[PDB]
Scaffold this active site. Structure first.
Site, PDB file in Angstrom:
ATOM      1  N   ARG A   1     -51.965   7.307 -45.598  1.00  0.00           N
ATOM      2  CA  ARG A   1     -51.929   8.391 -46.575  1.00  0.00           C
ATOM      3  C   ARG A   1     -50.476   8.826 -46.858  1.00  0.00           C
ATOM      4  O   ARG A   1     -50.089   9.086 -47.999  1.00  0.00           O
ATOM      5  CB  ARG A   1     -52.783   9.604 -46.154  1.00  0.00           C
ATOM      6  CG  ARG A   1     -54.267   9.264 -46.040  1.00  0.00           C
ATOM      7  CD  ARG A   1     -55.122  10.323 -45.352  1.00  0.00           C
ATOM      8  NE  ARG A   1     -54.776  10.446 -43.942  1.00  0.00           N
ATOM      9  CZ  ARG A   1     -55.319  11.313 -43.102  1.00  0.00           C
ATOM     10  NH1 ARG A   1     -56.278  12.131 -43.512  1.00  0.00           N
ATOM     11  NH2 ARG A   1     -54.897  11.351 -41.838  1.00  0.00           N
TER      12      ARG A   1
ATOM     13  N   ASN B   1     -58.821  10.214 -46.255  1.00  0.00           N
ATOM     14  CA  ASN B   1     -59.544   9.327 -45.389  1.00  0.00           C
ATOM     15  C   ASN B   1     -61.011   9.655 -45.519  1.00  0.00           C
ATOM     16  O   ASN B   1     -61.400  10.833 -45.490  1.00  0.00           O
ATOM     17  CB  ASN B   1     -59.120   9.636 -43.967  1.00  0.00           C
ATOM     18  CG  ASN B   1     -57.929   8.926 -43.410  1.00  0.00           C
ATOM     19  OD1 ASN B   1     -57.686   9.036 -42.198  1.00  0.00           O
ATOM     20  ND2 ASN B   1     -57.266   8.143 -44.225  1.00  0.00           N
TER      21      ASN B   1
END
Length: 97
Positions: free
Chosen positions: A22, A40
């Site tokens: 990320r 996620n």
């Protein structure tokens, strides 16, 4: 058309959790001038949305599917259709939880 803003959804599969995916994604989006978000998922994937001019958008899409993200192993990248939008809806690129 080059200053038009376009949008797409994405979901990345593979070894994409537990590897700073990320943070890498946010860094690359921001440095390519692409806005949006990612998260996620409960499916063990990373999903999100992008907004950018076509050129920038397609650069980001390439990076998400090119499988040269440090420590990540991408088995596949899925995308929605591209749509034009009137203006950015996101200020920047944000990691969601």
């Amino acid at each position: 058309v080059a200053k038009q803003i376009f949008a797409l959804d994405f979901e990345i599969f593979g070894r994409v959790q537990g590897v700073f995916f990320r943070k890498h994604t946010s860094h690359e989006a921001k440095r390519l001038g692409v806005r949006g978000w990612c998260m996620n998922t409960r499916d063990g994937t990373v999903k999100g949305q992008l907004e950018a001019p076509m050129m920038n958008l397609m650069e980001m899409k390439h990076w998400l599917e090119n499988n040269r993200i440090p420590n990540a192993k991408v088995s596949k990248a899925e995308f929605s259709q591209i749509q034009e939008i009137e203006d950015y809806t996101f200020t920047s690129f944000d990691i969601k939880h």
